[PDB]
Amino acid sequence: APKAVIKLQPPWVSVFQEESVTLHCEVPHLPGSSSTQWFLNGTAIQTSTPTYHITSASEDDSGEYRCQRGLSGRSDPIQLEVHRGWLLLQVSSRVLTEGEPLALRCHAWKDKLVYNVLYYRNGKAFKFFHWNSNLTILKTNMSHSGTYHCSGMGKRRYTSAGISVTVKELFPAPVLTASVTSPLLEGTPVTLSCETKLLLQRPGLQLYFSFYMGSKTLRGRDTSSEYQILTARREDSGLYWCEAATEDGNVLKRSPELELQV
């Protein structure tokens, strides 16, 4: 059976003291009237409903939460942090894969008002809002990793503490190697290759490559990784480029120019 999954409502992994948050234990195979096992830092929690509600957050609620219901495996841990301060930069996830959206919120203590808000990444402010607004980065990449914090103007200008977010890369830039050396005799077979492979352990993931030359398309998105010209006459010659992406195409990467001469 697949693993259970914990969801946060609101999804922010950092909350203020005395704020409320509800944890949802989701299992794919929908069960009926089955107990839910909740764990805080490995210690069993005395709550068995499918959801777990923290009514007034304190430091005792901080740590890793895991859940399990029925025949499911225990969920991957979600880390909840309880803070005190003026501003709190709330994120929807601490670790992400490229292409997965990231949500940011500059949260004011007791839901007070701040304006002229700055969102920071690694010490540099990259976004400015006259009126306080959340920020979503849909197509995340490795450059969006770093320490995030925010600042806003209330009675005085207040600044939140930092929190780190990592956007793990999926596959490097698919460089296009050359098996047969150039130049080469008209008439000799060629074997093209698109060089990239996964970095994370994604069991059900497959990249689909596309071989280009100049700007005209040759072979589109295909499960194969090699463009096979039967026997080369060099009008299929020049600047060849490859592209590797997900099936959804939410992360795309290019190749260097392989000047082929046959």
Binding site: L113, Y115, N116, L118, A125, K127, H130, M153
Partner: protein, 215 residues
């Protein structure tokens, strides 16, 4: 009452030396910061003693390191207009503002007073060191807008510092300028001049010399 935020405006006066030399160009500078990418258009309106003028030059938007925009409008002023106390008003309009922001600046009011300029040789206790201090005492001037320089033989001196104007007890200001020169240059009899520029001086300047001559 929830319309706080938007850009801010800062209005700066011309440099004192530019208002005193007719060859130079005195300018008042209207700087708008915290301009958002969503509302980047800034409109400037300039007024001189209430009547509008249209000769100001607006520099294009410039993104700052905090991802905000900064827009600057420069208005050339007439030398005598500033010295006569005319008021310069910058009105800034932007969609993120509930109403235009108005900033007004002008020369400090009050009867101008002529500065007295006195040059002071180095103390004989300082002559034991390799570098000596030449002192220019400028006192009794109003307003505090002033410029002080040093020169010798038609060339500016490369090593002097001037204190900020200090309010004296009679309502006027004073300052000191310290010129540091090598002891050999002083003992060899070179003539050093302290040049003071102020609106209350004839031709907006005076200069007093200083040289080693007890014998």
């Amino acid at each position: 009452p929830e319309l706080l935020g938007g850009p801010s405006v800062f209005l700066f006066p011309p440099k004192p030396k530019d208002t005193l030399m007719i060859s130079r160009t005195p300018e008042v500078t209207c700087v708008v910061v915290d301009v958002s990418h969503e509302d980047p258009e800034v409109k400037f309106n300039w007024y001189v003693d209430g009547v509008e003028v249209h000769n100001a030059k607006t520099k294009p938007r410039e993104e700052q390191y905090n991802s905000t925009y900064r827009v600057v409008s420069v208005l050339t002023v007439l030398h005598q207009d500033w010295l006569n106390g005319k008021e310069y008003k910058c009105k800034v309009s932007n969609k993120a503002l509930p109403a235009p922001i108005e900033k007004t600046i002008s020369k400090a009011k009050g009867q101008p007073r002529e500065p007295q300029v006195y040059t002071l040789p180095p103390s004989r206790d300082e002559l034991t060191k390799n570098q000596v201090s030449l002192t220019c005492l400028v006192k009794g001037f109003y307003p505090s807008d002033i410029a002080v320089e040093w020169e010798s033989n038609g060339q500016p001196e490369n090593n002097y510092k001037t204190t900020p104007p200090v309010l004296d007890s009679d309502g006027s200001f004073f300052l000191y300028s310290k010129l540091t020169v090598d002891k050999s240059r002083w003992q060899q009899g070179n003539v050093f001049s302290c040049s003071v520029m102020h609106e209350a001086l004839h031709n907006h300047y005076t200069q007093k010399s200083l040289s080693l001559s007890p014998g």
